[PDB]
Design an enzyme around this catalytic site. Sequence first.
Site, PDB file in Angstrom:
ATOM      1  N   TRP A 133       0.849  -1.188   0.000  1.00 39.18           N
ATOM      2  CA  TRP A 133       0.000   0.000   0.000  1.00 39.18           C
ATOM      3  C   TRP A 133       0.888   1.243   0.000  1.00 39.18           C
ATOM      4  O   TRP A 133       1.738   1.380   0.890  1.00 39.18           O
ATOM      5  CB  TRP A 133      -0.889  -0.052   1.238  1.00 39.18           C
ATOM      6  N   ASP A 214      -1.016  -5.399   9.403  1.00 39.12           N
ATOM      7  CA  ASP A 214      -2.035  -4.527   8.838  1.00 39.12           C
ATOM      8  C   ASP A 214      -3.177  -5.437   8.362  1.00 39.12           C
ATOM      9  O   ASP A 214      -2.998  -6.223   7.431  1.00 39.12           O
ATOM     10  CB  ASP A 214      -1.441  -3.700   7.692  1.00 39.12           C
ATOM     11  N   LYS A 249     -13.750  -1.707   5.242  1.00 35.41           N
ATOM     12  CA  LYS A 249     -14.154  -2.476   4.075  1.00 35.41           C
ATOM     13  C   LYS A 249     -15.048  -3.651   4.413  1.00 35.41           C
ATOM     14  O   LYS A 249     -16.036  -3.864   3.716  1.00 35.41           O
ATOM     15  CB  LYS A 249     -12.920  -2.960   3.298  1.00 35.41           C
TER      16      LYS A 249
HETATM   17  C1  LIG Z   1      -7.691   0.413   3.172  1.00 33.23           C
HETATM   18  C2  LIG Z   1      -6.354   0.018   3.760  1.00 33.23           C
HETATM   19  C3  LIG Z   1      -5.877   0.678   4.898  1.00 33.23           C
HETATM   20  C4  LIG Z   1      -6.596   1.859   5.504  1.00 33.23           C
HETATM   21  O1  LIG Z   1      -7.824   1.543   6.072  1.00 33.23           O
HETATM   22  P1  LIG Z   1      -8.753   2.743   6.514  1.00 33.23           P
HETATM   23  O2  LIG Z   1      -9.698   2.162   7.533  1.00 33.23           O
HETATM   24  O3  LIG Z   1      -9.462   3.292   5.291  1.00 33.23           O
HETATM   25  O4  LIG Z   1      -7.908   3.856   7.174  1.00 33.23           O
HETATM   26  C5  LIG Z   1      -4.683   0.312   5.481  1.00 33.23           C
HETATM   27  N1  LIG Z   1      -3.965  -0.728   4.975  1.00 33.23           N
HETATM   28  C6  LIG Z   1      -4.400  -1.393   3.852  1.00 33.23           C
HETATM   29  C7  LIG Z   1      -3.564  -2.503   3.318  1.00 33.23           C
HETATM   30  C8  LIG Z   1      -5.597  -1.024   3.218  1.00 33.23           C
HETATM   31  O5  LIG Z   1      -5.990  -1.719   2.099  1.00 33.23           O
END
Ligand SMILES: *Cc1c(COP(=O)(O)O)cnc(C)c1O
Lengths: 399, 399
Positions: A133, A214, A249
């Site tokens: 990312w 993450d 998500k």
């Molecule tokens: C979307 C995403 C984030 C951030 O998530 P948010 O809740 O929108 O801040 C962090 N790491 C990865 C790999 C993502 O795909």
Amino acid sequence: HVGTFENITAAPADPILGLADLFRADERPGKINLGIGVYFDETGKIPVLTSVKKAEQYLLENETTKYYLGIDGIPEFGRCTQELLFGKGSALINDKRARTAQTPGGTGALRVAADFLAKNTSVKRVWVSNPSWPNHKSVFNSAGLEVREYAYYDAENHTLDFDALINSLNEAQAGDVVLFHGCCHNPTGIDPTLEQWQTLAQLSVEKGWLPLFDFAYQGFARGLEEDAEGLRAFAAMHKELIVASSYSKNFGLYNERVGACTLVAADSETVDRAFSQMKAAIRANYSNPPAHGASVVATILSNDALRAIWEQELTDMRQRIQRMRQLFVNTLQEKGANRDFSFIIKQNGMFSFSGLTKEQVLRLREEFGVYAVASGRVNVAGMTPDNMAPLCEAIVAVL
Amino acid sequence: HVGTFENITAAPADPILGLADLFRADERPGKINLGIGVYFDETGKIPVLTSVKKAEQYLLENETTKYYLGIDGIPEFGRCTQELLFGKGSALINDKRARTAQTPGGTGALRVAADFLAKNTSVKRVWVSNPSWPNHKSVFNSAGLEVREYAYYDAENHTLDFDALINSLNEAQAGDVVLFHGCCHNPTGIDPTLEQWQTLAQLSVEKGWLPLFDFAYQGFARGLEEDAEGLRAFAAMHKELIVASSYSKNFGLYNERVGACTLVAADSETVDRAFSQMKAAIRANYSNPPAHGASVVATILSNDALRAIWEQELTDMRQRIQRMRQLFVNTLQEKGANRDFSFIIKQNGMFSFSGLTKEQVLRLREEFGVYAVASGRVNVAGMTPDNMAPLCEAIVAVL
Ligand SMILES: *Cc1c(COP(=O)(O)O)cnc(C)c1O
Ligand SMILES: *Cc1c(COP(=O)(O)O)cnc(C)c1O
């Protein structure tokens, strides 16, 4: 007096959110958005989940105050998050070895961890996969940490290059942080197998790394429990680890900013001591976290009937994406692509590395109104039965 | 290997939020909370405004997506904020000299400003009143900025010590940031008069300071427009300034984290260049801001009917606090205080600096169940007709 702002130089656009801005401005009616990683339904909308609307209705009729949450947020949100991550009867939980702070998104959880590490420990270096990312580097650099890259993707065979990964990470020293994606690697869609996770867990303890996970896509690869296996293999072995998770998500709650930062230490006394400093870092950032989205998540997970609805809605999102992966591959062949795109079926989550070059991605946008990220990352969840044909005709035209 | 978290030193409890935790733990009946700066109604509750419930109903029925906001948030929220601060026909707005980012609370606006300044300007030093909100120093220090203090309060006359303020700011240099509370100074309740603001504005431009206004209580002193007179005197004279504002208190939206960081520069091209870097600093922190709270504010401010309701609800809160100020003074006299507390009636907002010693505040907590901040700050908005007499007997007992 010459102004303090006169000499500021403009920032470059964000590679993901700037693409979204171009998309909104594009006047052409047939434009297709395969950029930012959100879920679209079959009709091309980004809907509010039914479990969410029901929980919001309960909140509207029963909330009696907006009084500040504690620095770490809603307690039940924290407990429910740890159970999702580590499992109903985890020893980390029963041994009181974990503390969770509710954060503004997964991004907020990454920055809180970064701030916490830079201000309270000797950590200087974070290891991130190549590719990853794009915002990972910006988060950790802004907290004052150096960012190093380890090998991951084999672009010739569309696979995890496990040998390269382990050779590059032999340069990571003890006390360095190593960042892993829990599942649905962003951008490649390629995750380790359980065996590979178990190999890294042992290597990690041997070399004294501090793992940071993450976890933005739990439930989009195979399932809620299955997607956490790699994390749970690490958690069985390590004395210390950090998890930054997101509900943006898997609850479709993007703009309400719902995430968690979970801290694990060797024993209860250490994690409480360390978590007192994490709370200080939060207080000096945004003070305390937004209630609405977190309250929705806690209402859903705490109520067996709502949770049942949500898990089915998440299953439906996971399966719609898998149907599009297949349809994408089949339609490319019908539209005259002679390249093999079969590797796309083996990738997990929303994203696939298409293999397209920057010049091809630029052509898709300018000539065909198809928007992908310049790395060739494509959002499969942006594909629908109605836009698949034009989308594939455009791709074949730039090959 | 040795644990990364073992060398960590525990952080002290927050002087305001730790107090609130102590209050929750206290099992003695009749305890009284005069700590944290929230509004309580006549029954001791922290209610949701009617205008906010109406706005939340409209959002529930009409929201079709939770798709991410832009980095800078809801556009109408930014425009309405600028009108509130600067006035409907401001030249700053007509000349397009201001940009506003929606942030997570007023704290988040302050932190975003601190990160922006530290990374994009030669600002090294921030000047804050002594006393001030204790979190100011933490926020700017978290970005690596030195915080110095200027004189403010005359503890003998319970008044602004304007001579000492002027003299103590003599060594603030061109390019230093000077922080001002827009109204309802926290903790003293003492604000500059209009002429004093005008004198400070002139001095600021001659010395080349960058003014930064913290506006958390707009509408709690005299009124929405009147409370911005000091800011607007600065705005008429300065090429550059920053305003961190909060809607936590004047909308009772504390836990939804609704604030704004407004940048002002010499011209449209300069502020847009500068604002591109403020957006980069947001993206590396929490990515984009929480929608629910700011959507409420934008809905109320944009709808003439809801706004008239809200302005009346804010007037009710302001007036209740002023009646408690007068009742507090009268009841102290009836309960036998010989110290003159008349200065309380001259102070603005939620807080009075009572003049109690740390020792007397501790006695009130431990011996009487009365909770104030250890500096002697008491939240007048936590006083009610029902708790006034026991509170006053307790204070008289420790004098
Ligand atoms: C979307 C995403 C984030 C951030 O998530 P948010 O809740 O929108 O801040 C962090 N790491 C990865 C790999 C993502 O795909
Ligand atoms: C309450 C307060 C803040 C913080 O506002 P939030 O919106 O709760 O983050 C900042 N400055 C002052 C002076 C305050 O009183």
